[PDB]
């Protein structure tokens, strides 16, 4: 089975947050629990009744044929929790297995046919993922900031102006909030078109229909790869500056052994009448006091914080004298991509890269040395070697459209030149509903 | 009436080409070209002059202005005091400033109420245009034609570029156009007439 | 492909003169490309040939 293929399943909290209220609002019976005594025909009856391919989990060991039915019709099982999930299924294959799941986002549009009750997409989830865990006080701050950008007076908002208790502050957080009638008991009643007004059935994140329309475009812009230019991680490595392209990441050579960085690895140790910052190498446990003579290591550094200066310096020394490759995944940076004539207006010490604050954005520059003309045949030889340490871990130049608009040999293309993408130029056409479209490819 | 929209002409996009040239390169062979063709193809052939080392597609800084609190100078939106630690000053160059930035992009696009009105427009007489452009042009165009690489066809000295672009445009899957084009909304009234450009 | 004529912008050039004995240490190493000549005064090609 392919990675898309398998048995879809989501945690209850996810189900409750999203699919359930939509089920209530669309007037369908609550989807059935699956005891494992459950017949596949029962599940089909339920998926008929709910107009959604969902079932809630109930109790241990789902029977085989019902499970095969869950797989064939892409029914979304809703697990109370993910612990020991495989025990819940009777896999005759014994092929179902923990850590064989593929976690992924799933748009609500994919499971609901009722288009009116769906506004956003995978995009907003993907953007919430970039966001820090948010205190309610931080949320209020964010809101008030957005307000001041838009010039509104948000004073006393989310507050109580009591005469005797003074001003008080309630939380402004209300993800997926709905207007619902409550019982005098204070508990919520399920929305009833019979008495509650129709405008109330589904608050659309409290936005105008137009703002939702634009919101879709914007979510498409924000999740677009070209705009995403806050790069993560740097690979430190000691090579001659050969490759012209900015997006270069040197390959790790065949003999290297990956080693997760940990404070445990480096230790002060006596060696030849002094206290070398010895590094013991985990495959063999051999201790190497000198930066030189250490085995080729591809040391990943997940967390720069708490690294000793003697140790940061020792790692970089090992990068040079023993040719270590040192990925440093904790760095977030923006990259300007300088042309050869503008050189390197900014310069960075290894010490700064090994000791930047964990949240601050570094600003690296990278040469695109492609537009650099051949040396005169009589220029004096360069005895010494140009050398380079810092590299991107993933591609930069995601924003690039064109490159090297100059001829090579007056006809032949330069290696590394890039023509603009074809999609820049398809002044397509409107769809019958006024959406933009690319021109049809082939026919019809 | 409520001013529900901001009527404007020759609209800003959310994205703009931005280019770096190594200025020592310059083709010896100057390209005298038609006057009317240079007022269409022109802003492009200047934006992608010989020696452009790189052409990027950035957020339009002129649109996502400092008025929205965004700074696009470092290549990502960066908004100053949205997501912040409380009880301490946030510090400079925070990475959260990027996430805040996307919100202010997402916000600013959510509320772009611009409504295009047709701006000043030329109707070149056609014999006055080289055929590659005349095939692209559709009757009329705004004088601020703006930039598009498809315009570089049969104009840029840089041969591989012209060969590859002509190679793209001659495929069925892509077909560039400019200015007035027929649309389902043509002739529709709303005080004035709707048109498609 | 043409041989360059205008004076090009070369990377900065460290000249770590190397003696009989020395204490190499690599804190404050430059990370951007940086040429590393060993001898002082390499401009030895002085006899120009018209």
């Amino acid at each position: 089975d392919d990675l898309d293929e398998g048995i879809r399943m989501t945690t209850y909290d996810q189900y409750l947050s999203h699919i359930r209220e939509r089920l209530h609002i669309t007037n369908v019976p609550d989807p059935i629990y699956i005891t494992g005594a459950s017949t596949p025909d029962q599940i089909a009856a339920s998926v008929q009744a709910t107009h959604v391919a969902v079932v809630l989990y109930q109790s241990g060991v789902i029977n085989g044929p019902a499970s095969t039915y869950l797989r064939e019709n892409e029914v979304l099982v809703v697990m109370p929790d993910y612990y020991d999930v495989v025990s819940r299924f009777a896999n005759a294959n014994l092929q179902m297995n923990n850590n064989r799941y593929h976690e992924s986002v799933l748009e609500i549009a994919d499971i609901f046919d009722q288009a009116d009750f769906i506004q956003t997409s995978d995009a907003v989830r993907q953007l919430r993922a970039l966001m820090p865990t948010l205190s309610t006080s931080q949320i209020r701050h964010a809101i008030e900031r957005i307000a001041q950008i838009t010039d509104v007076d948000s004073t006393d908002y989310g507050k109580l102006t009591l005469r005797f208790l003074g001003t008080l502050t309630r939380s402004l957080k209300m993800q997926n909030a709905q207007i619902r009638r409550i019982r005098p008991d204070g508990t919520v009643l399920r929305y009833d078109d019979q008495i509650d007004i129709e405008a109330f059935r589904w608050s659309r994140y409290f936005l105008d229909e137009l703002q939702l329309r634009r919101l879709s475009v914007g979510l498409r812009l924000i999740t677009n790869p070209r705009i995403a230019r806050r790069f993560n991680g740097v690979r430190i490595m000691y090579l001659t500056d050969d490759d012209p392209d900015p997006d270069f990441v040197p390959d790790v050579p065949e003999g290297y052994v990956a080693v997760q960085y940990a404070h445990r690895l480096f230790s002060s140790s006596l060696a030849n009448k002094r206290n070398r910052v010895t590094y013991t190498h985990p495959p063999t446990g051999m201790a190497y006091p000198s930066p030189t003579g250490r085995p080729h290591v591809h040391m990943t550094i997940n967390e720069r914080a708490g690294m000793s200066k003697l140790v940061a310096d020792n790692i970089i020394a090992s990068v040079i004298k023993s040719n270590w490759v040192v990925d440093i995944l904790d760095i977030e940076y923006t990259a300007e991509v300088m042309t050869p004539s503008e050189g390197y207006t900014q310069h960075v010490d290894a010490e700064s890269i090994m000791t930047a604050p964990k949240g601050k954005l570094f600003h690296l520059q990278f040469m695109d040395g492609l537009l650099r003309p051949e040396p005169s045949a009589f220029d004096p030889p360069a005895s010494g070697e140009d050398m380079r340490l810092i590299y991107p871990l993933q591609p930069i130049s995601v924003a690039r459209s064109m490159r090297a608009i100059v001829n090579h040999n007056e006809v032949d293309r330069p290696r590394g030149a890039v023509a603009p993408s074809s999609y820049e130029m398809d002044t397509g056409t409107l769809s019958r509903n006024g959406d933009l479209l690319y021109s049809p490819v082939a026919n019809g | 009436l409520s001013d529900d929209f901001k009527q404007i002409s020759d609209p800003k996009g959310y994205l703009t080409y931005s280019v770096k040239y190594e200025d020592q390169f310059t083709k010896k062979d100057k390209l005298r070209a038609s006057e009317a063709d240079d007022r269409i193809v022109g802003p492009t052939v200047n934006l992608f002059k010989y020696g452009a080392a790189v052409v990027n597609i950035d957020l339009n800084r002129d649109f996502f202005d400092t008025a929205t609190g965004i700074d696009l100078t470092k290549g990502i939106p960066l908004v100053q005091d949205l997501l912040v630690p409380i009880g301490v000053t946030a510090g400079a160059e925070q990475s959260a400033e990027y996430v805040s930035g996307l919100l202010m992009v997402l916000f600013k696009v959510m509320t772009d109420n611009r409504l295009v009105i047709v701006g000043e427009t030329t109707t070149p007489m056609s014999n006055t245009l080289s055929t590659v452009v005349n095939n692209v042009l559709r009757t009329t165009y705004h004088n601020n034609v703006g930039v598009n690489p498809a315009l570089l066809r049969d104009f840029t000295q840089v041969n591989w570029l012209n060969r590859d672009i002509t190679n793209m445009l001659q495929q069925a899957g892509t077909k560039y156009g400019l200015g007035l084009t027929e649309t389902r909304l043509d002739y529709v009234r709303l005080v004035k007439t709707i048109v498609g450009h | 492909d043409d041989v360059g004529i205008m004076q090009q912008k070369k990377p900065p050039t460290v000249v770590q003169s190397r003696t009989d004995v020395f204490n190499e240490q690599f804190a404050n190493e430059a990370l951007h490309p940086t040429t590393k000549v060993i001898f002082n005064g390499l401009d030895v090609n002085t006899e120009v040939q018209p």
Binding site: - | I8, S18, V19, G119 | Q7, K9
Partner: peptide, 26 residues
């Protein structure tokens, strides 16, 4: 003379819509 880099980005020219008093059609 020394080699030199330069940069350019397409300018905004968006303007509030003109208030013409003349009309195109009858």
């Amino acid at each position: 003379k020394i080699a030199t880099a330069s940069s350019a980005r397409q300018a905004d020219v968006e303007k509030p819509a003109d208030v013409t008093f003349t009309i195109e059609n009858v």
